[PDB]
Design a protein around this nucleic acid. Structure first.
Ligand SMILES: CO[C@H]1[C@@H](O)[C@H](O)[C@H](OC[C@@]23C[C@@H]4[C@H](C)CC[C@H]4[C@@]4(C=O)C[C@@H]2C[C@H](C(C)C)[C@@]34C(=O)O)O[C@@H]1C
Ligand SMILES: Nc1nc2c(ncn2[C@@H]2O[C@H](COP(=O)(O)OP(=O)(O)O)[C@@H](O)[C@H]2O)c(=O)[nH]1
Ligand SMILES: [Mg+2]
Lengths: 52, 824, 94, 189
RNA sequence: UUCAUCUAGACAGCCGGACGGUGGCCAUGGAAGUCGGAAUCCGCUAAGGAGUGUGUAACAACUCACCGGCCGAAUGAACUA
């Protein structure tokens, strides 16, 4: 009912992302280092756990 | 309006004007609200939250003689009795569903406008097609559609189109070839619309007959020209089957154009306030305001607007008769499954022909209870025959079969009752095909039961459910003095709920079954406060374990008496599962001749026919898979030891050494006995303390282990949502025995062994993993040894044993062969 | 015949059912091997093979999915060797 | 630098003997069909692919195996390649402009023409019928199989397709990148 | 400080190829490149790993390496402090 084509444009700005394993910030999916300085811009990341 | 008890009797006589249909609705798709918009409207009366239970509510309908001028089925008159049954929402309550179909032919299918057909709607749909029942859809909540979403004209039509589309699909996959056209189309005026909440409903057919006038277009052509490519040209007035014309400009679909157009205009002018369009469109549709209905504004105004345009009953009661079945054509193709036995019998042929005075064939589909001091009623369908207040009936119990006595009480009916949903009314008689009731059968029949008069006539079908009682729980009294009330109260429960089930455990606990947790609690509430009426207790249903070994003892067992005179030498070796199986299947009998038995146990199960013709005893219970094989040829007074021996054996086989629990697949091989001469030092008092301690020591050397039950669940799930289940077996050790099914039906049935300690709440997780799409058939399968040491409070089996002891208040450790050995 | 890796396409029209076989990798080590590697090894894990076989395999690849598109003989020295754990023919394959 | 340098010796060899060749373009290929067209001619016509490998062949026009490269070099652009033959053109040309036919829709790829589809049942049981639901395509039950209700124009000309719409199209057998490896430049002796 | 890519035409980018044996050895309730251990082969070109991830009940399907269209000089991996 959300049309899979828009439920991709939707996830593009919600699920399609990256998370810093230390501050949890929502970075771009392709980002290599966290843009926050609380974790000194770390390279340790993980794709934002895709829902199911 | 009301009808006298005698008009019901006279009206029921014409099975052609007998409408027996129920409800095919999803949990909250608005069935109760809609079905009761019909009572408040055209509901018949006697002469002068959660749906916990239900009955068959009856309504009257005086149709148009020319509407019945197109009804294809044997139909005589316009004096119709509508025996409407209310099937429960929610799943779990699929017991009442299966049973409400056995006492009907057709059924009313309800669907949500925006929630289309969720899993429960197709659950009820697949159940109706497995009962050969023909349905009729109704898309309710069209108000929450053009209000909670303000949906537009063309978009709304398509919304319904898809609703139709998805339903026909499940209908055609599980349909009947013996019925032909079953998937109801809005093109054939067999799927209405409306709002039970707003008090209205309408079919295309209502306007096809109201517009044949202003067009000279017959009603068969009106509704034909309203669904699909069927368009119109409001520029030349030429109904063209193309959305655009020569200018290439888009038109309105006839349905969204003439029929639906009023509706939106009403809402906005009514809700949003537009008094310059309310009285205006009022007369354009020929709607008439009177009194306080005239002054009304807002959402109140709109409700009453439809109560003058398309009042509920109107097209609703219309279709029920118009296309749905009556006993007549209905039983005339159903009779096969409705009678499980001779489909060519004279009693089964009277049902298929539908004879009101033929042999009395009435089946109580549910013992409908009441605040009648613990007494119920005998609610069921009278396939053929007349109920006489005192008539002698053959109470054929489903166990019973024509050439036997097994539960068959041919007694007579005290009083008889007419069903009215919640109203209890005493009638005289009742003709074939109609569903009625009868008090008095209760104290004779158990839950469900077939009734006849002819001894040739076999039993009818006892549901099939597919739902099955999977859940389990222990119910112990919170006061041992009121236990007697529980025993009786538990009995009443079974009778009440169609798929509910009470039964004793191997642990003594009174295990209680149900379908779902929702289900089970509803049952427990009616149990602690009503059925029994004493504070209960619901604990996890404790499993039984058969302590067992996996090899012959690490050394020969040596046990001596307490006075010290005799000692016993031997070694216990685990028997093949299929050999201990033969013991419990009644092939290797404990009452057999040691030769005949030993030849079939040696030639068939590969043993030494010496110790096989010397197989002393079975244990425990005398029929148990634990036997004592004789291998002592030197012992002089063996005869004064065989009896006292089986005594201390029957004690250890019915109470092991790991924590005092039974065993299984333990063939103890007797190799020696240091006997005496006088049975004064060879009596029970010497031989029993030895035989018991002997067995124990030998066991803890024979490599202990523990045996737990293993299930066999067959989950009926649609092939697309099958992913989740595979993973719930993946979480609770689920070896998939197999996976069979049918080429045309997606419903993939799946067999898979499931260990009892991993099925405690399984149903819920299985249900949450794939939605309630999966229906598990849990029927305990076989016994299977685990894979952890009993003396290991860290391994699977070990942890169990430790928890098992503290429960019975036993000795913490796992006492071994050193603590049961008698050395110098 | 063939027990494991048996990709079997079924092609039927109005009643007439057709039995059509793609004679895969597992089907060739059995169409060549006698009963010692054609049966009784279900409870056994068959991982034994060294013996030379020959040109009979250029036509054995004639029944295996013909989607390779070049030389029949040369492609099998590769397929039948490092993919088949029960046969090493002329030890050059690998 | 391994392959480019050793390939220089190979490239030069077939070009050094033969006096007949075809400049053929693609990109909308398929290893399967591509390497399967090499099978139609595994002795009549050899297919060699390239890139800046013929850009060193601008520096190769310099070598002069025969100075007539003044009618070949300047056609270096596109997923184009070698077509080695010493038999007549007209004959191998009927052949070359006939082995190019198959590509369906990479669900989201570049769509081109107006999609006009006829309304009849395709003989496939109701498996992907839930697709048709939230896609807007009136359907019915005609002998168990799914029957199309209109000669509807599902997808428009020139737009980024969706996975759900090209899935039903994949079972309707619509593969529109159909064409691919044909000709560009022709030259003899 | 190394290491070895590059106008002969890199890195990145955008256009589209990403095949076969093969649902490879079994192992399989089920495993087709993507539960698991062993093989990691050459047929052929520009290439396509018995396959880099996503996904499937397994398939489908998406997507990489490889390889090709264009662009045209760096600037890429690894370590040092
Ligand atoms: C048709 O309804 C069936 C099925 O639900 C299933 O076969 C169920 O199995 C119950 C148990 C049966 C086991 C064997 C017969 C030997 C051990 C018995 C059990 C003891 O722990 C294991 C399962 C679960 C029950 C424990 C919790 C006490 C059993 C019992 O009846 O006591 O029985 C009911 C009556
Ligand atoms: N908008 C709207 N809501 C409805 C309608 N009918 C029922 N409901 C809602 O559904 C609920 C009752 O569902 P019920 O009738 O209990 O579902 P059932 O048990 O399957 O029959 C109420 O709380 C209503 O808000 C309707 O016609 N329109
Ligand atoms: Mg209700």
């Amino acid at each position: 009912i959300i049309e899979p084509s828009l439920k991709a444009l939707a996830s593009k700005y919600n699920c399609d992302k990256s998370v810093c394993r230390k501050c949890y910030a929502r970075l771009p999916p392709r980002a290599t280092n966290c843009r926050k300085r609380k974790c000194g811009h770390t390279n340790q990341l993980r794709p934002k756990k895709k829902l199911k | 309006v009301a009808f006298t008890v005698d008009q019901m009797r006279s009206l029921m006589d014409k099975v052609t004007n007998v409408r027996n249909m129920s409800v095919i609705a999803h949990v909250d798709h608005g069935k109760s609200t809609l079905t009761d918009s019909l009572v408040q409207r055209a509901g018949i009366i006697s002469a002068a939250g959660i749906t916990i239970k239900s009955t068959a509510i009856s309504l009257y309908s005086e149709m148009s003689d020319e509407d019945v001028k197109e009804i294809k089925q044997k139909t005589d008159g316009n004096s119709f009795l509508i025996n409407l049954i209310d099937s429960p929402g929610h799943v779990d309550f699929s017991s009442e569903v299966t049973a409400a179909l056995r006492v009907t032919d057709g059924a009313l299918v309800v669907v949500d406008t925006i929630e289309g057909v969720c899993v429960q709607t197709e659950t009820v749909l697949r159940q109706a097609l497995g009962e050969r029942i023909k349905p009729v859809v109704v898309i309710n909540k069209v108000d929450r559609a053009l209000l909670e979403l303000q949906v537009s004209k063309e978009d709304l039509y398509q919304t319904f189109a898809r609703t139709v589309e998805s339903v026909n699909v499940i209908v055609s996959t599980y349909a009947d070839e013996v019925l032909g056209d079953v998937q109801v189309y809005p093109a054939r005026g067999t799927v209405a619309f409306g709002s039970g909440l707003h008090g209205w409903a309408f079919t295309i057919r209502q306007f096809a007959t109201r517009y044949a006038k202003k067009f000279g277009v017959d009603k068969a052509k009106m509704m034909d020209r309203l669904w699909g490519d069927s368009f119109f040209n409001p520029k030349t007035k030429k109904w063209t089957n193309k959305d655009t014309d020569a200018e290439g400009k888009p038109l309105e679909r006839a349905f969204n154009m003439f029929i639906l157009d009023p509706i939106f205009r009403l809402f906005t002018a009514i809700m949003n306030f537009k008094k310059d369009e309310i009285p205006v469109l009022l007369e354009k549709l020929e709607i008439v305001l009177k009194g306080d209905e005239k002054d009304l504004e807002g959402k109140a105004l709109l409700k009453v607007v439809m109560r003058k345009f398309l009042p509920a009953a109107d097209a609703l009661l219309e279709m029920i008769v118009l296309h749905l079945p009556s006993p007549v054509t209905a039983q005339a193709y159903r009779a096969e499954q409705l009678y499980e036995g001779p489909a060519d019998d004279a009693n089964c042929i009277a049902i298929k022909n539908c004879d009101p005075k033929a042999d009395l064939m009435l089946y109580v589909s549910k013992m409908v209870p009441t605040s009648d001091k613990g007494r119920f009623y005998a609610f069921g369908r009278v396939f053929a025959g007349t109920v006489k207040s005192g008539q002698k009936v053959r109470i054929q119990g489903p166990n019973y079969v024509p050439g036997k006595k097994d539960d068959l009480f041919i007694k007579a009916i005290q009083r008889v009752v007419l069903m009215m949903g919640r109203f209890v009314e005493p009638i005289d008689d009742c003709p074939a095909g109609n569903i009625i009731g009868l008090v008095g059968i209760d104290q004779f029949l158990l839950k469900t039961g077939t009734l006849t008069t002819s001894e040739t006539a076999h039993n009818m079908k006892v549901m099939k459910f597919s739902v099955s009682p999977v859940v389990q729980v222990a119910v112990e009294v919170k006061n041992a003095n009121d236990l007697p009330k529980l025993v009786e109260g538990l009995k009443r429960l079974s009778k009440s709920d169609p798929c509910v089930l009470t039964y004793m455990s191997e642990s003594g606990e009174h295990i209680v079954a149900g379908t779902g947790e929702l289900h089970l609690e509803i049952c427990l509430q009616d149990l602690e406060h009503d059925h029994a009426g004493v504070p209960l207790k619901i604990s996890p249903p404790v499993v039984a374990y058969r302590e067992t070994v996996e090899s012959e003892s690490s050394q020969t067992a040596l046990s001596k008496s307490p006075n010290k005179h005799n000692r016993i030498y031997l070694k216990a070796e685990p028997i093949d599962e299929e050999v201990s199986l033969a013991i419990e299947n009644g092939i290797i009998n404990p009452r057999d001749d040691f030769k005949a038995r030993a030849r079939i146990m040696a030639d068939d199960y590969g043993w030494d026919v010496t110790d096989a013709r010397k197989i002393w005893c079975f244990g425990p219970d005398g029929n148990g898979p634990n036997l004592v094989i004789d291998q002592t040829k030197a012992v002089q007074y063996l005869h004064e030891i065989k009896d006292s021996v089986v005594a201390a054996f029957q004690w250890a086989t019915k109470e092991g050494p790991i924590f005092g629990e039974e065993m299984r697949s333990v063939r103890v091989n007797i190799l020696d006995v240091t006997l005496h001469a006088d049975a004064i030092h060879r009596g029970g008092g010497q031989i029993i303390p030895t035989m018991r301690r002997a067995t124990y020591a030998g066991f803890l050397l024979a490599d202990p282990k523990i045996q737990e039950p293993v299930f066999l669940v067959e989950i009926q799930c649609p092939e697309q949502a099958v992913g989740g289940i595979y993973s719930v077996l993946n979480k609770k050790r689920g070896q998939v025995v197999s996976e069979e099914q049918r080429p045309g039906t997606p419903l993939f049935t799946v067999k898979a062994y499931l260990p009892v300690n991993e099925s405690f709440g399984f149903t819920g997780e299985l249900r949450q993993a794939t939605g309630g799409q999966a229906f598990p058939q849990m029927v305990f399968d076989h016994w299977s040894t685990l894979g952890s040491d009993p003396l290991d409070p860290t391994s699977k089996a070990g942890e169990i044993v430790l928890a098992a002891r503290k429960r019975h208040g036993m000795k913490e450790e796992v006492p071994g062969w050193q603590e049961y050995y008698d050395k110098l | 015949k063939g027990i494991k890796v048996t990709v079997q396409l079924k092609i039927q029209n109005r009643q007439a059912a057709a039995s059509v076989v793609p004679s895969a990798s597992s089907l060739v080590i059995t169409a060549l091997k006698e009963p010692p590697r054609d049966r009784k090894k279900d409870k056994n894990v068959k991982h034994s093979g060294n013996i030379q076989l020959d040109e009979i395999i250029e036509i054995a690849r004639q029944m295996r999915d013909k989607s390779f598109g070049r030389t029949l003989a040369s492609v099998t020295k590769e397929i039948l060797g490092t993919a088949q754990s029960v046969g090493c023919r002329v030890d050059f394959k690998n | 630098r391994e392959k480019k340098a050793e390939y220089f010796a190979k490239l030069r060899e077939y070009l050094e003997e033969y006096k007949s060749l075809f400049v053929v373009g693609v990109d909308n290929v398929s290893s399967q069909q591509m390497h399967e067209v090499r099978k139609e001619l595994r002795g009549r016509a050899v297919v060699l692919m390239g890139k800046n490998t013929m850009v060193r062949r601008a520096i190769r026009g310099f070598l002069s195996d025969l100075p007539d490269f003044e009618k070949l070099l300047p056609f270096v652009k596109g997923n184009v390649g070698f077509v080695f033959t010493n038999e007549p053109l007209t004959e191998i040309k009927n052949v070359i402009v006939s082995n190019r036919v198959a590509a369906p829709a990479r669900a989201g790829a570049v769509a081109p023409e107006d999609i006009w589809v006829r309304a009849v049942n395709t003989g496939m049981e109701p498996g992907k019928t839930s697709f048709f639901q939230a896609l807007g395509v009136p359907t019915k039950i005609a002998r168990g199989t799914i029957e199309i209700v209109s000669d509807v124009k599902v997808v428009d000309a020139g737009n980024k397709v969706g996975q759900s719409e090209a899935s039903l199209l994949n079972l309707l057998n619509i593969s529109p990148f159909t064409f691919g490896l044909t000709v560009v430049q022709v030259y003899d002796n």
